[model samples]
Target: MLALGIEGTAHTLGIGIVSEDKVLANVFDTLTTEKGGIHPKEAAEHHARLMKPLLRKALSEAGVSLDDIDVIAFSQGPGLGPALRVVATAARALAVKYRKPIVGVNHCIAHVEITKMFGVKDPVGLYVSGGNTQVLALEGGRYRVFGETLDIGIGNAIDVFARELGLGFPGGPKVEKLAEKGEKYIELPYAVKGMDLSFSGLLTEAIRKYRSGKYRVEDLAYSFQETAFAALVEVTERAVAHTEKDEVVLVGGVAANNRLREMLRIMTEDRGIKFFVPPYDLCRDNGAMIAYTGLRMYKAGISFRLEETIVKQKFRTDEVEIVWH
Candidate 1:
């Protein structure tokens, strides 16, 4: 079946077309800022404005018309309210116009599902993004959350710190680049409580140290990554040991960090387990993951009526039942 998916959970607006075994087109446009971070309403406007063009482009690249699509899917939540609404509304409109079955895919679940498409089999997932950080594994026909952030997500923490230092928006990548030049590792709070992790304290301390002029920004950037990623790696390792999963897969936007990948690779290698990281395009929030996951659900007779297509702002990763697997 041909599936077309819409994704607008946050700063990005993406449209993708996919079949059962192939991703025909995955196109994205991001809302960027030179300073400050994303404004929800502005981001929503961007999504709304770009939807038509992105859809046309996606379909054209896929060499298909809207009539060829049999199913529609959208990133239905755990994101900014305005952004989610724009995506949900667009999805509903298409479903009605095209008379296609529609499914609301959980944003977090799509992250893991796409990795499976890339050949990772039954692995523990480390889903780290601007808004979420969690360790997940499939058990009892559900993706269970093994560990998660107690407060702000790791990406948000890094971005927040970067903004405070007069850095540009989308600070994660800039922090990663600066961290490469850092020679010293300034001390920062490392807070990992049991299987859950917290970054609020670390963020506060890092900002304070930077303000105090006791360390270079590069050192702080390196220290922040080291401290934060170590906490994540530790929890993931514990989850892997507990779940007895032989493979580990990293997903979400933060998975683009080479340092985090290297740390995870080291841990997985030492444990003699498999490790998987999808291409950068698949790692970030995009429509292909939603399309692929929605196609699976649609094939399994899972779909939502128009009234049931509301977006979820705080959807938990473990809430949905795993019917396809």
Candidate 2:
């Protein structure tokens, strides 16, 4: 069956078309700022503006039309209400227009499910992004959160502090580049409580150090990245040991970080477990992950009624049943 998925969880608007074995088209546009971070309500309007054009582009790229699509899927929740509502509305409109079945997918689980395209089957997942940081694994027929952030997500810590340093939005990559030039590891709080992490203290301290003029920006960047990634690795390592999972996969937008990849690699390699990361396009929020996930659910005989198509902003990762798993 062919599936079309819409993704608008945060700053990006993506449309993906896929078959059971391959992605036919994957396209997206991310809202960028020269300064500061995202404005959720404004972002929702931006998504609404681009929705139709992006949909057309996706279909054109895929060489398919609405009539050819067998199912429609959208990022249903665990996202900003306005942005999510725009995506949900688009999905519903398209589904109703085409008389197709619509599936509401969990954004977090979509991150993990897309790993199947990379040959990863049931690995301890370390999902990090602007709005999320969690270590998860499938258990008891559900994707359970083994550990997660207590405050801000790792990427949020990076971007917000990057703003304090006067950098633009999408700061993770810029900060990673600056950290490369860093020669000193300025001390920053490494708040890993039990199996969870707290980046709030770490972010505040780094910003204080930056404003105090007592440290170089590169040094601060390196220290912050090291401290935050170290906390992430620590909890993920514990999850791996506790769950005894033999494989690991890095998902989410922050998985684009080279440092995080190397760090996770060291831990997994030492444990003699395999590791996987999907192509960078899929690493960030995109249509294929949503479409592929819905494709799996539909083929498995799980269907969603039109009434179930409403968005859920605070949707938790562990809330959905992993019936396919």
Candidate 3:
């Protein structure tokens, strides 16, 4: 079956199509800037502008016109309201005009579900992105969260700090590069409460250190990455401890960071749990994930009617029952 997946949750808007076994087309473009972080309203406008063009490209790349598609799958929630609106609107439009079945998928869960395509049976997913932090694993009809960020996401903390340092919109990679040079482990707060973690306190402390002008930027980047990642690693490992899972998949945008990957890798190795890290591009927000997830759910007898397709601006991942899994 042919599935067209549309993704627009944040700075990137992607359109992907997949069949039962392979990806027919996976095309996406991320909005990047030389300065400042993402402005939600403007990001939505950009997604609105690019949706049609991306759809055309995806259909062409898949070598099939919209008329041939059996389903339209779109990102549904736990994302920016404006951006989610754009994607939801596009999917509904396509479904109505083309007479294809439509399904709404969770973006975060999509990030984790894509791991199944990579040969993971089930994993304690450490999903770290500009949006959220979650240590989740699927069981008992849902992807339950064992731990999560109590404040801001780890990537957002890094990006805001990067912006303050004038490092541009996506600072994770840049910060990782700069972090390799530091010799000092500039001290920062470590907040981990019963598997749930917090980053704003550490971020604020790091920024205050920066403003003090008493440390090198490289030093701060190194320390921030170290401290923030440490907290995540702790909670994720604990999740593995309690869940008794044997696999760990690093999901989401921040998985691009070699240091975070390395840290999590070492932890998984210590516990003898297989580690899975998708391609850097795949780790980021993209449509193939949504499409694949949508297709699976559709096969399991799940499809959203027009009235049931409203965007969920905020819904916990554990709230979604794993119908396909």
Candidate 4:
């Protein structure tokens, strides 16, 4: 069966057409403002304008038509309400018009699921994105939250701080660029709450220090990246130790950061554990993951009746049975 998946959890409008275990076409259009981060209404409007083209291009490139698709899937929640509504509306409308089934997918869990397509076993997952920073593990058929930020996500903290220093949107990559040229490391607070973590305090202090001009911005950026990634690596290591798991898988947009990848790799290596990561494109939000998940679910007879199907902004990952695992 063929599946068409739509993703608009944030700035990207990704469309994917897939059959069982094969992604025929995956198309993505990312909308980023010069100011940095996604403006809610603008992102939603971007989705409204670009989704149709993306989906159409995906289908055309895949050599398939709407009639060839068996299921339609969309990201439901844990994102900006306006952005999510765009994809949800598209899914609902398409499903009804084509008389196909619609499936609502969790945005975060889709990251882990897409990584699993690479054949990693039960590894601890770190989801780092613009609006979310979480450390998760699978247990009792649920994804348990081990560590996460208290205020803003790790990416948000970095982006907001970078913008203050004149860095553009999506600070993770921008900071990494300048951080590579940095010299000595500056110190930042490492706040850990049991299995939970926080970045707001560190962000505030970093901003204050930047305003003071006593420290070089590159040094601050390098140190902040090291500090936050170290904290994540340490917490993830602990979680792996506690769970007796032998592998660590990094997901989300920040996984693409070379320094963060190195940190996780060193930690896992020191502990004699395996480390896995998704491709940069799959690291962020996209429909290939959704289409892949939908393919698995459709094959397993996991279809929602129109009456029972509904969109949600905050669906829990643990609630779904991870058949791909």
Candidate 5:
């Protein structure tokens, strides 16, 4: 069976058409980045505006008709409530009209399950993004959070710092670019509490250093990147050692950072393990992964019943039933 999927988490609106084992069309539209976090209302409006055309484009690219799709899948939770509802409504309406099954997908699990499609062997996941940073292992049919951030996410910290520095939205790219011009390292606080970490304290210290005029902006930015990236690598490495998993899969927007990837790669190599990072576009919030996830659920006969439909802003990954490992 073929499935069509929708992802409207954060600022992106994605649509994908997939058959068993292969993606046919995965289309996406991202709103222009602003400094720091986006307003939920604006993000929802953006998704609503782009949703129709993108969905049609996916179908056209795949050369498939509504009648040909057997199921519709959509991200249902652990995101902005308004954004989730936009996609959920679209999915339910399409499924009802087409007489097709609709699947309410977990966004976090979609990140992990999509990794499986990449053909990686039993990999643990590190999801670092705007709202979350988690070190997880697939166990007992769920992606259990072995370690995670105690405060703000790594991406959020960068964005907040960038905004304070008069750097615009999407701090990961900005910080990465600025680091190239950096000359020296400016030390900042490293808050590592056992397996869990808190980035807010580190962010506070980095901003203070930046404002103190004791160091160059480039140096401060570079140092900040190193500190945050190291924290993530440390937790992930510890998880690998504990879980004894040789495969590491990197997910979320932060995975797009070259310097961060370099840090993780070094640790993985040191541990004699392999690493899997998705293609650049797939790394961030996108419809392709959502579509890929839906296809898997459809195959497993895990589509949601109409009566059970719901949208949530915070769904725990471990709460999901493991229909397939």
Candidate 6:
């Protein structure tokens, strides 16, 4: 069956079309700022405004008409309420108009499901993004959170600290770029609580050190990246040992980081476990993940009624049952 999925969990609005074996189209538009971060309401409005053009483009690129789609899917939760609502409303309208079954997919689980499309099986996942950071594995028919951020997500902390230093918005990339030129290593707090992690203190100190003129920006960026990635790798290593999983997969926006990938590759290699990282396009939020996951759920006889279409802002990854597996 062919599926069309809509994604608007944050600053990006993506439309994807897919069949059982392959993605036919994956298109997206992102709302960006030179400095500061996203405003949820404004981001939602951006999604609403771009939905029509993006949907049409996605269908055109996929070489299919809307009538040809067999199912509708949307990123339904664990995101900004306004952004999620925009995606949900759009998906619902399409489902009603086309008389197609609709499925509400957990965004995090969608990330994991997409990796399986690339040959990962029963692997531990390290999901990191601007809004979330967690180590997860499928257990008890659900994606259980083995570790997560205690405060701000790793990406957010990096971006916020970058903004404080007059770096542009979406600071993670800029931080990584500068880190390459850095030669010195500055000390930063490393917080790991058993299986959980925290970055608020680290962010605060990074900003403080930047303002105090004690270090170069490049060094500070390098230090922050190392410290943060180390914490994440540490938790993922523990999760792997605890679950006794033989493979590790990295997903989400922050998975684009070269440093994070290198660190994870080393960690997994040292343990003699296969490591996987999706193509860059698949790493970030996109409709392909949603469409692929939706196809799985629909084939598993999962469909949501209109009454159950409400978007959730605090949906947990572990809340959804892995019925498709």
Candidate 2 overall Cα lDDT vs. reference?
0.90
Q: Report backbone clashes per prediction.
A: 0, 0, 0, 2, 2, 0
Best by lDDT: 1
Model 3 gets an lDDT of: 0.88
Give lDDT: candidate 5, residue 95.
Answer: 87
Model 2 misplaced regions, further than 4 Å = none
lDDT of each model, Cα atoms only?
0.91, 0.90, 0.88, 0.83, 0.83, 0.90
Which parts of model 1 have CA positions greater than 4 angstroms off? none
For residue 55, give model 1's deviation from the true position in Å. 0.4
Give lDDT tens digits, candidate 5, residues 1-325: 7888898867788888877677788888887865447678888888889988998899899899989988888988788888888888889989888898888878877877777777876778999888888888877776788888899888899899989888888777898899878888777888577879899999999888878888888888888888888888888888898889989999998888889889888999988999999876677887778777777777887868876568878888887775766
Across 147-179, the per-residue lDDT of candidate 3 in tens digits comes to 888988889898999988878867888888889
Pairs of colliding residues, candidate 5? 34-169, 35-169
Q: Sorted by TM-score, highest first, which candidate order results?
A: 6, 2, 1, 3, 5, 4
Q: Please, what is the TM-score per model?
A: 0.97, 0.97, 0.96, 0.94, 0.95, 0.98
Tens digit of lDDT per residue, candidate 2, span 75-184?
99799998999999899998888899989999999998998976788889999998899999988889989889998888888899877777778788999999999999
| Pairs that clash in candidate 6 | none
True-structure RMSD, every candidate: 1.3, 1.1, 1.3, 1.7, 1.5, 1.1
Q: Score candidate 1 by lDDT.
A: 0.91
Residue 50, model 1: lDDT of 95
